[PDB]
Write a structure and sequence with these properties.
Chain A: The modification (Microbial infection) O-AMP-tyrosine is found at residue 34. Chain A: This is Transforming protein RhoA. Chain A: It catalyses: GTP + H2O = GDP + phosphate + H(+). Chain A: It is a lipid-anchor. The structure is cut from a larger assembly and holds one copy of chain A (180 residues) and three copies of chain B. Chain A has 180 residues and is of the alpha/beta class. Chain A is 38% helix and 23% strand. Chain A contains six helices and six strands; from the N terminus they run βαββαβαβααβα. Chain B is built from 25 helices and four strands. Chain B has helices at 3-12, 21-28, 46-50, 61-72, 75-79, 93-99, 103-112, 140-146, 150-157, 176-182, 188-208, 225-232, 235-242, 285-292, 298-302, 305-343, 357-383, 387-406, 411-425, 434-470, 484-497, 504-507, 511-541, 545-566, 569-574; strands at 257-263, 266-272, 579-585, 591-602. Chain B starts with a helix and ends with a strand. Classes of the chains: A alpha/beta (180), B mainly alpha (605). Chains in contact: A-B, B-C, B-D. The A-B interface holds A 1-5, 40-43, 54, 65, 69, 72, 75-76 and B 33, 35, 40, 76-77, 80-82, 84, 89-90, 115, 117, 119, 121, 165, 167-169, 171, 212, 217. The complex binds guanosine-5'-diphosphate and magnesium ion.
Chain lengths: 180, 605, 58, 58
């Protein structure tokens, strides 16, 4: 029948795999060299519970004018995909401090999902050494559930855009929450 | 090179200047969709600016812009860039090409891959009631349908590249057929293409999808296009839908008025009672028409032959009998309640012995009136012109019963008040009579609510002022004590009416201030009563000759629908109007068994 | 007695019988105002016909 | 109570760029019918530093 359209907004810190996740979901191909700052004006066809949903993927960035025009993307949203890198924890501790309030102020009563992008780096040796140089450890799944507890988000699933693992169930959960 | 000069190049349509833009974008890694090429407030990119500055219907800079965009690889984002301003949010470049009546450019963008299902969510794309100007359904196909562009609609629905399905709905759920009902006026020129495009789209959606009826996709408010037409006061499209006839055999199952037999001038037409009489299964167009429709065209739609004859048949079948049964039942219940309250002994504190046979009769009558009250609560909480007054009556009687069980004597007063409301409520039954109709229609409920407000203000004023006066009384006729307030209130009311005596002035220590306060109190009470009478006469003369001449049909329709809604659903189906008839073969090939109502008419042309 | 009271002043002797005179006062005043409104309606009917129906019918 | 000159002074816009300090109704953006204008509030919402056109008017 008619394919409903749901508005999806992906917010997160700089270089936390937002645009890469959107491109992997949409074009099925991980960007090699030229990853755009924002992946904009794309609608993706997904099937959930035998219902056709067109996900209007809206991307937000934290650089230059994008910080100024990020507020304008929030109106009419249906699901919010807050993003934090699994490898980079600073996003995880910043999510509750800045991201949870900004989304709540412009998107009341809207489902909230926080996703652990760059999951592949959890076991990466280089990233582990870089974190140990700064006395840090990769985000644990238990830590992710603990962060979701503070916000009260719809759910927490980890994504690895480079390996194309988890890039589908996250959007399925997002459109399921939007269908509510 | 720069936005201020580039927006001038596209406006002037100078292809000879845009030559160097592509090398500039390649060497600076810039795309036409970056904020350096977008107006900041309106997010208007180059293409929307190119779509208004049209000379002779053509702008040669648009193909050049598209060719530059495809080389940059941003063609999808350039062709679908939405405005960000609250007044135009969501308006992509496709809506501008459809509003400007440019079929060639609509073809160009749809071929290049423009979003054919882009929702324009701006404030101007909101209904007039919600603070907007042009509500067209928010979709590119709906905009073309509401703009009276049949060729653009056909192109959009039959694109080799990507076709817009007619079953899509906007944020409010309004489909393409709903958007043709919200843009339809009552003028003759407007209704000769709204109905034409309505039928065009309905048949197109019937052939494309034989198993789907586009007139069956309810919006977010649960209204089909027919119910939306009934609610929003659009008479022409409502008549067209209720009298729709289509000749094509493949899509002839969409008709609603099937001719059955004819004899020269006279002929019988079976109208289809779909959403006109659902027997409470779903919303019925008649119920939205009588209650929800606040437009002045309610009487015109009630005069449409299927609806009028359906109401007449409902009245004939069980309307009069059930109306008189309800009148008799209420009258007998009120008489029983009056008798049981009267014969009540009230010997000392409640409860009271029911040992005596007369006492047992009182108890039985109290049980009967309690059952009536609890029935009214059951109906009201099932719901949750007299509903509110039947509810307040039941709340009052239950409060009285709770006081009587508690042993509080005060019950009589509360119980008495309830009885008064019961006698006032009986006027609903007298709504039809011409003599007291105008009083029963709106006075007894609306005027009683405003009157309750008025005597609430009056009672608070009188009580506070009585306290103020008794503050001045001589403590020790009307000397200050424990029961001073009640007797003083009685005396004050007596002076307000005119049956008072100036024995009050003898007690007071200070006559002059007491006289001043009383004269001011008479002034304010007279002002209150005068304002009450002013409002009374104003909203009495609010009913006018046209009103009083048209109300009766509506009130009789209200009477019949209430009586018909009072019945249980099985009883609702038992007294259905019309009969099943094999109107014809459906899309799947099975015959359509539709409940149809036979109306006999004449055509002399 | 109530017919006499509604046609003319009647000293309000019945409030001697009542336990609660305030509710009796409220009922009396609401009954009087309802009667006045009903009279105004059933007499504005004729006045409305006189000022509304003489346009072509008289 | 001169409505014409008051109206003109309130929405005075000078297109000349050499002397644009005089203008009061600057235009931030304007697409189609909608005009987003910054109206200068000098001497209107004075806040007590200066007499207010609102106070005199009301
Ligand atoms: N190892 C790994 N690297 C990733 C993944 N997703 C993105 N990246 C890299 O992270 C960089 C920043 O990602 P990007 O999407 O540009 O950040 P954004 O614009 O803030 O979303 C990219 O250049 C990617 O190469 C991932 O799942 N795993
Ligand atoms: Mg990005």
């Amino acid at each position: 029948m008619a394919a409903i359209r749901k508005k999806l907004v992906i917010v997160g810190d700089g270089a936390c795999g937002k645009t890469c996740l959107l491109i992997v979901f949409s074009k099925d191909q991980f960007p090699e060299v030229y990853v755009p700052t924002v992946f904009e004006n794309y609608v993706a066809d997904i099937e959930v519970d035998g219902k056709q949903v067109e996900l209007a993927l809206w991307d937000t960035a934290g650089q230059e004018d994008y910080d100024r025009l990020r507020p304008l993307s929030y109106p009419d949203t249906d699901v919010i995909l807050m993003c934090f890198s699994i490898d980079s924890p600073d996003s995880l501790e910043n999510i509750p401090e800045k991201w949870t309030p900004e989304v709540k102020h412009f998107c009341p009563n809207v489902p909230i999902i926080l996703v652990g992008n760059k999951k592949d780096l959890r076991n990466d040796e280089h990233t582990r050494r870089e974190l140990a140089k700064m006395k840090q450890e990769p985000v644990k799944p238990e830590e992710g559930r603990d962060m979701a507890n503070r916000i009260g988000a719809f759910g927490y699933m980890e994504c690895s855009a480079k390996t194309k693992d988890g890039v589908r169930e996250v959007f399925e959960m997002a459109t399921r929450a939007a269908l509510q | 090179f720069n936005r201020p000069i580039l927006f001038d190049i596209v406006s002037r349509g100078s292809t000879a200047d845009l030559d160097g833009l592509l090398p500039f974008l390649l060497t600076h890694k810039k795309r036409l969709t970056d904020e350096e090429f977008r107006e900041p407030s309106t997010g208007k990119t180059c293409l929307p600016k190119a779509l208004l500055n049209l000379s002779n219907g053509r702008n040669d800079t648009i193909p050049v812009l598209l060719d530059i965009a495809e080389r940059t690889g941003n063609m999808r984002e350039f062709i679908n860039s939405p405005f960000r301003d609250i007044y135009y949010r969501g308006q992509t470049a496709l809506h501008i090409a459809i509003e400007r009546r440019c079929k060639h450019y609509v073809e160009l963008l749809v071929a290049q891959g423009a979003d054919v299902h882009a929702q324009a969510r701006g404030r101007f794309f909101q209904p007039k009631d919600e603070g907007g100007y042009f509500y067209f359904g928010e979709l590119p196909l709906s905009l073309a349908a509401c703009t009276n562009q049949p060729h653009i609609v056909n192109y959009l629905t039959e694109n080799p590249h990507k076709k817009a399905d007619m079953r899509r709905q906007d944020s409010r759920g309004n489909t393409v057929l709903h958007a043709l009902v919200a843009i339809a006026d009552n003028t003759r020129e407007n209704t000769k293409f709204v109905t034409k495009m309505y039928d065009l789209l309905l048949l197109k959606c019937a052939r494309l999808f034989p198993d789907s009826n586009l007139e069956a996709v309810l919006n977010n408010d649960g209204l089909s296009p027919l119910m939306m037409a009934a609610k929003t006061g659009k008479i022409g499209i409502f008549q067209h839908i209720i009298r729709r006839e289509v000749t094509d055999e493949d899509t002839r199952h969409l008709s609603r008025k099937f001719k059955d037999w004819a004899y020269g001038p006279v002929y019988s037409s079976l109208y289809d009672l779909s959403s006109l009489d659902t027997c409470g299964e779903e919303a019925s167009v008649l119920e939205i028409l009588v209650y929800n429709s606040k437009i002045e065209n309610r009487h015109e739609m009630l005069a449409v032959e299927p609806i009028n004859e359906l109401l007449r048949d409902k009245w004939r079948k069980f309307g009069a009998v059930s109306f008189y049964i309800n009148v008799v039942s209420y009258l007998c219940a009120m008489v029983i309640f009056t008798l049981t309250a009267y014969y009540q002994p009230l010997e000392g504190t409640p409860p009271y012995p029911y040992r005596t046979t007369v006492d047992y009769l009182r108890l039985a009558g109290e049980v009967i009136t309690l059952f009536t009250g609890v029935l009214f609560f059951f109906t009201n909480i099932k719901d949750l012109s007299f509903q509110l007054l039947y509810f307040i009556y039941s709340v009052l009687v239950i409060v009285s019963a709770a006081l009587y069980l508690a042993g509080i004597e005060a019950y009589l007063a509360v119980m008495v008040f309830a009885l008064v409301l019961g006698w006032m409520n009986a006027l609903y039954f007298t709504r039809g009579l011409k003599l007291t109709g105008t009083y029963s229609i709106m006075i007894q409920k609306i005027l009683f609510k405003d009157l309750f407000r008025f005597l609430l203000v009056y009672l608070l004023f009188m009580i506070g002022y009585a306290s103020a006066l008794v503050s001045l009384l001589n403590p020790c006729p009307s000397c200050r004590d424990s029961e001073t307030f009640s007797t003083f209130l009685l005396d004050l009311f007596k002076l307000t009416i005119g049956m008072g005596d100036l024995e009050m002035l003898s007690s007071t220590k200070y006559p002059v201030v007491f006289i001043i306060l009383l004269v001011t109190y008479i002034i304010l009470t007279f002002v209150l009563l005068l304002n009450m009478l002013i409002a009374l006469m104003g909203e009495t003369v609010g009913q006018v000759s046209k009103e009083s001449k048209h109300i009766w049909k509506l009130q009789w329709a209200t009477t019949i629908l209430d009586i018909e809604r009072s019945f249980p659903v099985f009883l609702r189906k038992a007294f259905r109007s019309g009969e099943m008839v094999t109107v014809g073969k459906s899309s799947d090939g099975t015959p359509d068994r539709r409940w149809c109502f036979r109306v006999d008419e004449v055509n002399w042309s």
